[PDB]
From a paper:
Nucleoside diphosphate kinase (NDK) is a housekeeping enzyme that plays key roles in nucleotide recycling and homeostasis in trypanosomatids. NDKs catalyze the transfer of the γ-phosphoryl group from a nucleoside triphosphate donor to a nucleoside diphosphate acceptor, using a ping-pong mechanism involving a phosphohistidine intermediate. Here we report the crystal structure and spectroscopic characterization of L. braziliensis NDK (LbNDK) under distinct pH conditions similar to that faced by the parasite in the macrophages.
LbNDK crystals belonged to the space group P213 with a dimer in the asymmetric unit. The LbNDK monomer consists of six α-helices partially involving a core of four β-strands arranged in a β2β3β1β4 antiparallel topology order, as observed in canonical NDK structures. Inside the highly positive active site cleft, a phosphate ion (stick representation) is bounded to Lys11, Asn114 and the conserved residue His117. As demonstrated for other NDKs, LbNDK also conserves the key residue His117, which is essential for phosphate transfer, Tyr51, important for catalytic mechanism and Phe59 that stacks with the base of nucleotide substrates. Analysis of symmetry-related chains in the crystalline unit cell revealed a hexameric arrangement similar to that observed for LmNDK. The dimer interface (712.4 Å2) is more extensive than the trimer interface (467.9 Å2) and comprises residues mainly from α1 and β2 elements. The Lys30Nζ atom is the main hydrogen bond donor to carbonyl oxygens from Arg104, Gly105 and Ala108 residues, contributing for trimer stabilization along with the Lys80-Asp110 ionic interaction and the hydrogen bond between Arg17 side chain and Arg29 backbone. The region not modelled in the LbNDK crystal structure (gray) contains only two amino acids residues (Ala146 and Cys147) that are not conserved in LmNDK (Val146 and Ser147). The trimer interface area of LmNDK, whose C-terminus is structured, is 727.9 Å2 whereas in LbNDK, whose C-terminus is disordered, it is reduced to 467.9 Å2. Besides the probable influence in hexamer stability, the lack of the C-terminus interactions at the trimer interface exposes a surface path formed by Pro12, Asp13, Gln16, Arg17 and the region from Val109 to Arg113 that might be explored for the rational design of compounds to inhibit hexamer formation, considered essential for enzymatic activity.
Numbering used by the authors:
A (entry chain B), D (entry chain B), F (entry chain B): 2 to 139
B (entry chain A), C (entry chain A), E (entry chain A): 2 to 142
The structure:
């Protein structure tokens, strides 16, 4: 119930006008929004977000895209919010994403995948701490 | 076109799960979101927000309500966005609000009117400066 | 706030699959559902419902239409719920109805106007007693 | 085509303002609503609804919750309406419920699961007869 | 009831992904779709469409915009469908448009007003003949 | 990215007022509509659409239904639009169609399945060419 997850709507999600849509899907699940802000990520932050792929191909283009414009960062709170958050977004692979999910309804690309969610509670604590100051959290 | 307005979703709007709904209505109109944050207002900020009603007996209930929980602050950018924002929200008094507008669809109280919008370009410049730092405001295309 | 109004979705509203849509619009406004049932009106009930038009030549077509199939009866509770219910429904004549309202979005006929709402607190008290038993009305918070 | 199923929106479903939403999902499937009422279940009825769990744990709290406030009872008619009704609601387990379904979109708990549907035609005939008088059915 | 009107979704409406949304609003009203096509207007057709403004200096920007990409042409059938179509679209100038209407919800420019509707039965008969062949128009129940 | 698929909303889809709904689901996926028209199919065309089933049962009734009224033909363009198009529609079998998909939300029958999508790129090139003239395509 005090569980928290980090959700980030990426620059494509913002440009396509899907910010309210994504938030609505978490509100209607019954999750509690406890932190929220918009910002344009720096290159260093984009690199941090994708640090697991630095030796991986096209890492630069991922980084460029992530910092190509403003994103919206959220912290959602609730039971199983990390795992439920993943389910709401849908499969990482649009060839497997199901309609009813955000990526299923809106995402066509696996890299520009509209939104990000924490893959574990461990990832979430780290991601929340990275993007948010303690004070910004209700 | 570089015009900006301040929109605030109040604690009832947040508690009732209307945050995304309200944002979606501005995105559909074609307005550009350039600042966004959640915060729990201090008593002082709530009082500043309602400063024109400081001598009224319900000034107290407004402030108490406004700071009762987290709110969501936005800055929207676009042509006529200030007046258009008012039109999207609907009449401040839901008893005058038309369905299709946010207050028309969701608000039942004149006090709990879900959200606030700037009444002028002058008010908007003031409200944005009050709630937002220059850095917190984006400039994308 | 303990105020109650009677809302009826008519047979066309039911046949066109608008039952949930209409109920959702009252839930969003923040009104409280306290009675709900489906029934097929008798000729006598339909006539009672339209009693003020009993001397009109289209009284017959109204009654026939009203009892043509099952209707859905509701009682909604909340502040200003009677007048607000009327505003949510829109003008009785869809030719005067504004988009955003139920008749504005869905109704094309002045006769088949999808739904009915009580015109006053007095009418509502009468209509609820006519369509509902005291037991059929809930009292929750 | 004369097949019928029983659907009950539970006290949480009513308080969260989801009554119209759930009905809309059955109307848009093309099912025919033939009985509908709101009532606050008695303790005896709540016990009846959960009779399969009386020797099961926290049975009292389930019963308390079911009768904690008004519910909305429905009878929907159509082909495969029992099985289709289950699919529309989604998996009993929110860790398996899919977005697009009612529980997938709205339910976070497995007990307070927003709504109920008949698990079989046999269960349906019994449930419909229990909650509804023959006269209340169109 | 056999009345018909011409509705056109303009290139901005198509590019912004509002085609289905606009069609859904006419289907909900209960109007009957009897002709539908996508095409990219020629300069000559765009000029014909705006012929009443041929002497105006912004005639050029309208035509350029109207033929900037594919549009979607529709013919809707039903009682009062011409005037009702106008009401569903909302004021031609989004600065007068009410939320609940298409322009009220989506349009920000007086020039880019998303869509067009026939202003009269006379205009509709003319517009349908101009954009559609007799064969392209269905007659179902 | 130049990939195209053929989508046809059938006479039931049009009568139930689902034309805008289906189109909206492709627009929000990010696919590009490049051809669109309404027409009442001839018997010969209905036979062509179902040619794989001519030796199959009730083939006549399928044909009668397909030409029972006006349909809406579309060509959608985008990456994986053929396969994504299938996923958006959902399983051919309503006992397997998932809510969130068009058939999952609206279709109750396997024959009157609301809409049609190309099963392959090969089928798509053929179907597009059959229903559309080159000029009708943007």
């Amino acid at each position: 119930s005090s569980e928290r997850t980090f959700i980030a709507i990426k620059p494509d999600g913002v440009q396509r006008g899907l910010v309210g849509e994504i938030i609505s899907r978490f509100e209607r699940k019954g999750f509690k929004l406890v932190a929220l802000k918009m910002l344009q990520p720096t290159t260093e932050q984009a690199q941090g977000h994708y640090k697991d792929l630095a030796s991986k191909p096209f890492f630069e283009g991922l980084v460029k895209y992530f910092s190509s414009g403003p994103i919206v960062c959220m912290v959602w709170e609730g039971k199983n919010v990390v795992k439920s958050g993943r389910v709401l977004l849908g499969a990482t692979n649009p060839a497997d994403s199901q309609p009813g999910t955000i990526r299923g309804d809106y995402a066509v690309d696996v890299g520009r995948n509209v939104c990000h969610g924490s893959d574990s509670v461990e990832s979430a604590q780290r991601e929340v701490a990275f993007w948010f100051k303690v004070e910004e959290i209700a």
